Design a protein around this ligand. Structure first.
Ligand code: CU
Ligand code: CU
Ligand code: CU
Lengths: 118, 115
């Protein structure tokens, strides 16, 4: 494929509002998307106060790094809050979700194999 | 089926070769866990350097802390916390810390690149 290097301020990427049956109060920035990635994609998620990504599972893994705030992670059994500087590995098919129980925006990097889209 | 951990608590590996000095690397999500790509966290001391190199796989980076000097095929460019970098396969690249404090970034590569 193409040559070169992209270097960009992540916040300059246009966010997309996510509103589905299981997601509310979330915006996503596709940093390294399907148009460019040979193998896996990089997204930056922002969750507003009270926002929620309800428990779900999917047949690809997810790799996360928490960039800002206190993120509540929903698990098959119960929940756990993590903060900036934590990483999360979600195995394929593992139940997971996310909630923001704080008064300010929470952000994380999420990477998936490109077969799961962007 | 879910790992949640503070990245700092992963023991860093000092890297010192002919080509790399003043760098520590943490493997956060490595080959034991990852089906497709790995997650590392690099910390570079003031004056640390990863000399120009290239590899057959791509690299995806997110700058977490500080002002990172990126060595390119042509010259160099400085970036800061909050920048992402996409390095195409085979693109020459390296890194330097010209500041007086530690610089950190996340680096992800496909598993063919090892951890
Ligand atoms: Cu998911
Ligand atoms: Cu499980
Ligand atoms: Cu490299």
């Amino acid at each position: 494929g193409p040559s070169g290097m992209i270097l960009k301020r992540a916040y300059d990427v246009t966010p997309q509002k996510i509103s589905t049956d299981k997601v509310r109060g979330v915006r996503k920035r596709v940093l390294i998307g399907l148009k460019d990635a040979p193998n896996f994609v990089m997204r930056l998620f922002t969750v507003e106060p009270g926002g929620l990504i309800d428990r779900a599972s999917h047949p690809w893994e997810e790799e996360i790094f928490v960039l800002k705030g206190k993120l509540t992670v929903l698990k098959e059994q119960g929940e756990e809050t993590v903060e900036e500087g934590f990483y999360i590995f979600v195995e394929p098919n593992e139940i997971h979700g996310f909630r923001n129980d704080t008064d300010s925006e929470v952000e994380w990097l999420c990477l998936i194999p490109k077969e799961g889209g962007e």
